[PDB]
């Protein structure tokens, strides 16, 4: 122990009067509501209570920004499914106790309600009641959080205007240490209700609330199914020598549920399609099966905000498929066949799945007549796999899903890898397609429709045979996972452990390599 | 999980094996598959009657394999084979033991290598819903029959149509399950308790809030529905099941009207 | 300090225990170390790691773990203290939380550890953090001979460790937990002391390995060694045991049962390559064998090659009655063999030119030599199921099995170098562990090979509670050790405990 640090940042007399809690809202609710007297007795870490100051941050960056509420306590974020209302103050501890060699100052303000959200530059965060605390302080910094409010209580739905508590990197973080490393002070946030916090009106406890942090399935990422091709997952890995910000279209889903682009929910629509067929025999290319595309569940396809029906193959290549076609020959009636449709522009094309029409074809000698009907085509093989967007409309612009990014300097993308069946006449290795989140997570976010809080989720990756934490990644709220990795060779990870969320973190959160 | 049920919606009715190719000119390529788990792990014979996800319906089956060959002009290729799942009283198929024999109609001797394969269903001939040959001729451990029911309840069936090789007929080959995927997942991911003998579900259409029926999801993962008609009765498939409560085994459902 | 009410110990359990027995007052003076109460925080650890997790009992104190065989019960609190070894230039915290005696299991994230009654300790504290360990219980007292649910201390890394590091070592911050009974610990009812208790540490036989007997082939043990070249994860079926006394696979108690079988003699002459006998296997103790969990009867060979059993041949031909002929048996597949010991039938073939008038009876077989020996599972069934012991692993990065090599009788026609079969535990440990039936505490013992004459270590290996020894080797050449020392159990370690490089 040494006291070449800052002793304590003892809460300065912040210029603010005391604010009444449940004493104003008590003669206006029709119930007597009290919460366990032991919840007021220990400081437990916030749901959004984990940040980090690296030396790549600049003065002005907002480290944390958390509105007074019940979302500041794992205890009260759970109790607030039974009630509709709350009032009162909270007491927040800020734990930054950085190394003895670091230097820098953060400033924690008390932003009132109705103050416009957005910029909050560094010149004006000091005009609020604030506390300027060094990042070396040893003992935690208790700082209040008052319920300045216009009304008697707030409803437990976040559309309330409530007093925020912004923290801002005031001076940048530097280190004296003589050796080749700048420490990354990582603070935490602890919170406990003040003496007169109170909930208001007992209501049915519903789980689907604005709190209830994201959960992931307890299924290993090697039993999961892929979200870009119908196969299992054969290993997740991180590769810096690849297209860093790809523009894939399947397996891309927000965390708050809304799917993006051409991604389905069912894991049997991916790479498949459903259409109404028309077969025409030619002495050249054989048949020319014109498919008019409908959805795989039955409803017709009207071209809207999706560049193709839900699940259309979002890559480029030569896809050989399987359709059950009915023949007019006498002796057999039903037969599964194999056509072969292009997806890459191939310097010439006729298909435009954005307009709802694709053109397959198979080479056969006889004038093979088939009963023109409606079919479901599933993939069978790919020849010359290219991981680029096909021509959804002929050469026209289509409504696409944005490319997967952006990442902080140093953060690479975590890719779930699966190998597809291929037709290589010379090559002998395995073709590998990569997705961002497997279909088991797209079917999991669609069914829960969480309330995303800030920008991203910490994750872990817990091994299941040893209980060992392998790495911590960052799930950005657009449904991709970025982890810090500065190496050159593609690093691969064991595929047995399960993921587990930790907390919500801003975009500036620097990971551990 | 019970029986050979997998978690992924992509493990269903397919296998993964370490192939072995020999009668190279008698009938074609007679491949023998030493089955392993689809995730790569080695299969050990316990209380499941087959690897996880192995097809449990009877009939001939087509499979798509990847075939590392040696001929010049092609290095890899997808190959269709012939699988014989049904009993047939003469078949060297023992999926419980870990060996499975498939064949190809081939006049030549197209030679392959003994690498690993992830086979895939293509089309079934002579479909029939009955226990296939798990041993070669012997008994295995397997899940109990789907029962029992109260007097007046029938089994709610989910229905999907497959690919079928058919010489004469032209109808759709309907296969029936108890719970679809996204229900076998979403179980064994969050493990619920039970607290009683059934769940009273309440199927209602998401538009206009019409109540379609009311069913009992018995704790053994199958839905009973008190229907006293004679023939079938199909419901729309654009509603959402909603758990209402736990109900004892004796609970009496409101009848549905044909 | 911590938000808990004071918990009554021996005052709630007194009106219902025949006696309340006091403890030597010199035991409430010393802080004695807790088993498995040590950790180390490297700068490569992510917050969320669980450094220790230990449950209130009398197993936390060597004084009480020994006093608690004379008695029936116990009640009361303990005082623990955590010492941390870090200087003024470190930075990082560690949260020590009191987990109630239920609250099942799973990954406790750092979001959830701060929700128990806890204490948040900086790594750079000077004096040891003292904290209680209360006895929250549903019952009046506890029973000493039955592990039950009591309050845990769980330690978690809250924020990571930020330091410099020269080039070696990498500055890990060590920490150690030390406990003593609170002022109101009590045992309950004096019984006569028993020896087969549950706080009885695993002891090993005092026998040099050179004096031992092999487990897979009935011969002495001629050398223990590491060898990073051979299959690192074998699947042997003899010499497999659990340190808690459970025999794994076809491992027998005795060493006479190894590579042997008692069979039914079903003799009949044939004019082909010679005489052929089909053997209906049974258990060598004379009990009826049925196909069960094991892949073969107890002791049946687990190697692959050309083995030659001997006899029990009673010949009614005049001139001699009981002789000792040499049959021959094939263990590898060879693509032509009806080898199915699983179902209880084996085929043996001797190359005879005339009829051997052999009575049908009950025989038992003894190996003579092997031809073409391969370290590979034999055909317990033709190409069929084999419920068998799993492979021997997994090991940490940079740890290789420690094998007890013996040499078997080789029939050769091309060379003379002796071949080495090897197991993981000599047949003395397989009988020791079964006869004692210890109680596995965590995950892996920590042996210590010493020399009895000199008195200096040879290496520190690690006996996993699955029945095999690992050893942290860096190089690549087979490094052979002396075979004149003694194994000595030190303590229980976790799986991730990193050995010292040999
Ligand atoms: C081509 C289907 C019959 C052949 C079959 O069962 N499988 C072929 C490939 S796969 O195993 O389905 O993967 C037919 C029979 C059931 C049909 C479907 C059903 O009639 C339900 C809807 C009805 C809509 O009018 C058209 C789409 C649709 C969704 C149909 C699509 C498609 O024409 C289907 C699927
Ligand atoms: C030749 C296989 C590539 C084909 C594929 O992966 N899926 C095709 C099915 S589908 O149309 O996409 O639906 C390769 C890629 C990944 C391989 C697998 C992986 O190597 C994992 C295991 C472990 C062992 O390598 C052997 C079996 C195995 C299960 C492998 C089988 C087979 O060698 C696989 C499956
Ligand atoms: C054939 C046995 C004689 C011993 C022998 O042939 N070799 C001993 C050395 S070695 O391993 O062959 O290397 C005889 C003598 C002892 C007999 C056994 C003993 O009589 C004990 C039981 C008695 C039961 O009635 C029959 C089975 C049995 C188990 C007998 C089997 C068999 O008849 C045995 C084993």
Which DSSP string corresponds to A234-271?
--EEE-SSS-SS----SS-B-TTS-B-SS--SSTTSTT
* Architecture per CATH, C258-371: Beta Barrel (2.40)
Closest ligand (CA of A381): 2
Q: A152, A154, A170: which is closest to A162 by C-alpha? A: A154
Q: What is the 3-state secondary structure (H, E, C) of C203-256?
A: CCCCCCHHHCECCCCCCECCEEEECCCCCCCCCCCCCCECCCCCECCCCCCCCC
Spatial neighbors of B91 by CB under 8 A, at least 6 apart, are B84, B101, B133, B136
Strands B164-165 and B121-128: parallel
Spatial neighbors of A492 by CB under 8 A, at least 6 apart, are A235, A236, A237, A238
Distance CA C418, CA C143 (A): 56
Positions of chain breaks in chain B, given as the residue before each break (C to N > 2.5 Å): 22
* Architecture per CATH, B12-125: Beta Barrel (2.40)
Q: A221, A238, A216, A231: which is closest to A496 by C-alpha? A: A221
Instruction: Select from A333, A336, A427 the Cβ nearest to the Cβ of B170.
Output: A333
Q: Mark A61-76 as b/e (b = at least 16 C-beta within 10 Å).
A: bbbbbbbbbbbbbbbb
Residue A441: which H helix or E strand, with range? helix A439-445
Reduced to 3 states (helix: H, G, I; strand: E, B; else coil), residue A320 is strand
Reduced to 3 states (helix: H, G, I; strand: E, B; else coil), residue A78 is helix
Q: What is the 3-state secondary structure (H, E, C) of chain B?
A: CCCCCCCCCCCCCCCEEEEEECCCCCCCCEEEEEEECCCCCCCCCCCCCCCCCCCCCEEEEEEEEECCECCCCCCCCEEECEEECCCCCCCCCECCCCEEEEECCCCCCCCECCCEEECCEEEEEEEECCCCCCCCCCCCCCCCCCCCCCCCCEECCEEEECCEEECCCCCCCEEEECCCCCCCCCCCCCCCCCCCCEEEECEEECCCCCEEECCEEECCCEEEECECCCCCCCCCCCEECCEEEEECCCCCCCCECC
Per the document, the length of chain A is 513
What is the CATH number assigned to the segment(s) C1-200?
2.60.120.20
Distance CA A438, CA A426 (A): 31
For residue A387, what are its two tokens?
A: 């991981």
Distance CA A153, CA C495 (A): 53
Q: A92, A97, A85: which is closest to A108 by C-alpha? A: A92
Q: Is C24 exposed, middle or buried (0-12, 13-18, 19+ CB in 10 A)?
A: exposed
Reply yes or no: is the peptide bond before residue B120 cis, omega within 30 of 0: no
Specify which residues C362 forms β-bridges with: C264
Interface touch B97/C387, C-beta < 8 Å: no
Using the structure block, give the residue that is written with the tokens 């800030």: A454
Q: A435, A300, A277: which is closest to A358 by C-alpha? A: A277
Q: A99, A3, A186, A181: which is closest to C166 by C-alpha? A: A181
CB A281 within 8 A of CB A369: yes
Tell me the nearest-neighbour CA distance from B138 into chain C, angstroms.
Answer: 13
Interface touch A99/C394, C-beta < 8 Å: no
* Spans of all domains in chain B: 1-11+126-258, 12-125
Distance CA B133, CA B136 (A): 6
For residue C451, what are its two tokens?
A: 């020399």
Reduced to 3 states (helix: H, G, I; strand: E, B; else coil), residue C347 is strand
Q: Is A225 exposed, middle or buried (0-12, 13-18, 19+ CB in 10 A)?
A: buried
Instruction: Select from C383, C385, C386 the Cβ nearest to the Cβ of B96.
Output: C385
The number of beta carbons lying within 10 Å of the beta carbon of residue B191 is 7
Distance CA A498, CA C70 (A): 46
Q: C59, C63, C48: which is closest to C110 by C-alpha? A: C48
Specify which residues C444 forms β-bridges with: C464, C493
Say which CATH class A270-383 falls into. Answer: mainly beta
Distance CA A351, CA A394 (A): 7
* Architecture per CATH, C201-257+372-502: Beta Barrel (2.40)
The number of beta carbons lying within 10 Å of the beta carbon of residue C353 is 8
Q: What angle do CA C169, C175, C179 make, to 5 degrees?
A: 155
For chain A positions 19-48, those within 8 Å of chain B (CB to CB) are: none
Distance CA A414, CA A434 (A): 9
Task: Please tell me the residue having the least CA distance from ligand 3 atom 21.
Answer: C286
Q: C459, C457, C461, C433: which is closest to C447 by C-alpha? A: C461
Experimental method: cryo-EM
Resolution (A): 3.1
Spatial neighbors of C437 by CB under 8 A, at least 6 apart, are C196, C244, C245
DSSP state, residue A420: P
Q: A97, A99, A100, A1: which is closest to C87 by C-alpha? A: A1
CB C196 within 8 A of CB C145: no
Using the structure block, give the residue that is written with the tokens 């409010």: A149
For residue A355, what are its two tokens?
A: 């307009």
- Is 3.30.1640.10 the CATH classification of the domain at A213-269+384-513? no
Q: Answer whether A1-212 and A213-269+384-513 agree in fold.
A: no
Reply yes or no: is the peptide bond before residue C169 cis, omega within 30 of 0: yes
Q: C71, C63, C74, C6: which is closest to C35 by C-alpha? A: C63
* Spans of all domains in chain A: 1-212, 213-269+384-513, 270-383
| CB proximity C383 to B under 8 Å | yes
Q: Is the CB of C154 under 6 A from ligand 3?
A: no
Tell me, which fold does domain A1-212 have in CATH? Jelly Rolls (2.60.120)
CA A352 to chain centre: 31
Tell me the nearest-neighbour CA distance from C198 into chain A, angstroms.
Answer: 25
Reply yes or no: is the peptide bond before residue A224 cis, omega within 30 of 0: no
Instruction: Select from A74, A186, A500 the Cβ nearest to the Cβ of C159.
Output: A186
Distance CA A205, CA A207 (A): 7
Interface touch B96/C388, C-beta < 8 Å: no
The number of beta carbons lying within 10 Å of the beta carbon of residue C88 is 13
For chain C positions 390-419, those within 8 Å of chain B (CB to CB) are: 390
Tell me, which fold does domain B1-11+126-258 have in CATH? Nucleoplasmin-like/VP (viral coat and capsid proteins) (2.40.510)
């Amino acid at each position: 122990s040494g006291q070449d640090l800052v002793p304590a940042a003892v809460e300065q007399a912040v210029p603010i009067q005391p604010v009444a809690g449940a004493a104003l809202a008590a003669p206006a609710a029709g119930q007597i509501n009290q919460i366990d007297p032991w919840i007021f007795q220990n400081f437990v870490q916030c749901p959004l209570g984990e940040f980090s100051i690296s030396p790549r941050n600049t003065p002005g960056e907002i480290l944390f920004d958390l509105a007074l509420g019940p979302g500041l306590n794992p205890y009260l974020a759970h109790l607030s499914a039974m009630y509709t209302g709350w009032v009162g103050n909270m007491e927040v501890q800020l734990v930054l106790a950085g190394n003895a060699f670091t230097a820098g100052k953060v400033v924690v303000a008390l932003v009132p309600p109705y103050f416009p959200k957005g910029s909050l530059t560094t010149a004006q965060i000091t005009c609020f009641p604030h506390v300027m605390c060094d990042v070396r302080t040893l003992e935690p910094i208790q700082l209040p959080l008052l319920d300045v409010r216009r009304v008697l209580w707030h409803a437990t739905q976040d559309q309330e205007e409530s007093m925020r508590l912004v923290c801002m990197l005031y001076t940048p973080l530097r280190t004296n240490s003589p050796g080749d490393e700048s420490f990354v002070v990582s603070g935490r946030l602890l919170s406990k209700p003040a003496a007169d916090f109170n909930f208001v009106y007992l209501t049915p406890p519903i789980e689907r609330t604005i709190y209830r942090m994201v959960d992931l399935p307890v299924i290993q990422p090697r039993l999961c199914t892929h979200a870009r091709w119908p196969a299992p997952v054969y290993g997740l890995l991180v590769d810096p020598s690849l297209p860093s910000n790809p523009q894939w279209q399947n397996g891309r889903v927000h965390v708050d549920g809304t799917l993006l682009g051409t991604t389905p929910i069912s894991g049997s629509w991916v790479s498949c399609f459903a259409a109404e067929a028309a077969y025409e025999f030619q002495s050249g290319t054989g048949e020319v099966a014109t498919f008019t595309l409908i959805e795989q569940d039955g409803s017709a396809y009207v071209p809207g905000d999706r560049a193709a029906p839900l699940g259309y193959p979002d890559f480029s290549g030569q896809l050989e498929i399987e359709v059950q076609t009915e023949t007019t020959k006498t002796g057999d009636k039903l037969k599964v066949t194999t056509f072969e449709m292009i997806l890459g522009p191939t310097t010439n094309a006729d298909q435009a799945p954005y307009q709802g029409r694709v053109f397959a074809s198979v080479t056969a000698a006889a004038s093979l007549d088939l009963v023109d009907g409606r079919v479901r085509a599933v993939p069978r093989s790919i020849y010359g796999f290219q991981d680029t967007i096909p021509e959804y409309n002929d050469g026209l612009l289509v409504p696409l899903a944005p490319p997967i990014g952006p990442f902080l300097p140093g953060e690479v993308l975590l890719r779930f890898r699966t190998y597809m069946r291929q037709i290589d006449t010379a090559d002998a290795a395995a073709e590998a397609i990569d997705c961002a989140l497997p279909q088991e997570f797209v079917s999991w976010f669609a069914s829960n429709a969480f309330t995303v809080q800030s920008e991203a989720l910490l994750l872990r990756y817990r091994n299941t045979l040893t209980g060992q934490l392998l790495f911590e990644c960052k799930l950005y709220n657009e449904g991709y996972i970025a982890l810090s990795y500065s190496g050159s060779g593609p690093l691969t990870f064991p595929t047995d452990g399960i993921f587990e969320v930790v907390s919500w973190v801003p975009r500036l959160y620097q990971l551990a390599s | 999980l019970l029986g050979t049920t997998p978690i992924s919606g992509s493990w269903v009715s397919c296998f993964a094996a370490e192939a072995a190719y020999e009668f190279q000119s008698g009938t074609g390529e007679v491949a023998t598959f030493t089955l392993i788990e689809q995730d790569g792990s080695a299969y050990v014979p316990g209380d499941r009657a087959a690897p996880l996800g192995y097809p449990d319906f009877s009939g001939q089956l087509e499979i798509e394999v990847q075939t590392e060959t040696t001929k010049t002009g092609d290095k890899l290729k997808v190959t269709t084979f012939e699988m014989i799942l049904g009993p047939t009283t003469n078949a060297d198929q023992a999926p419980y033991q870990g060996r499975v024999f498939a064949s190809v109609t081939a006049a030549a001797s197209l030679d392959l290598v003994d690498g690993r394969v992830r086979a895939v269903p293509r089309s079934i001939y002579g479909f029939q819903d009955t226990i296939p040959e798990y041993n070669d001729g012997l008994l295995v451990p397997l899940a109990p029959p789907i029962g029992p029911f109260l007097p007046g309840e029938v089994l709610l069936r989910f229905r999907t149509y497959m690919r079928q090789i058919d010489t004469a007929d032209a109808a759709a080959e309907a296969i029936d399950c108890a719970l679809p995927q996204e229900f076998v997942s979403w179980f064994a991911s969050n493990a619920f308790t039970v607290q009683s003998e059934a769940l009273l579900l309440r199927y209602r259409n998401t538009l206009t809030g019409q109540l379609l029926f009311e069913c009992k999801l018995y704790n053994e993962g199958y839905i009973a529905l008190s229907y006293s008609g004679s023939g079938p009765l199909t419901f729309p498939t654009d509603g959402i099941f909603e758990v209402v409560s736990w109900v004892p085994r004796l609970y009496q459902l409101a009848s549905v009207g044909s």
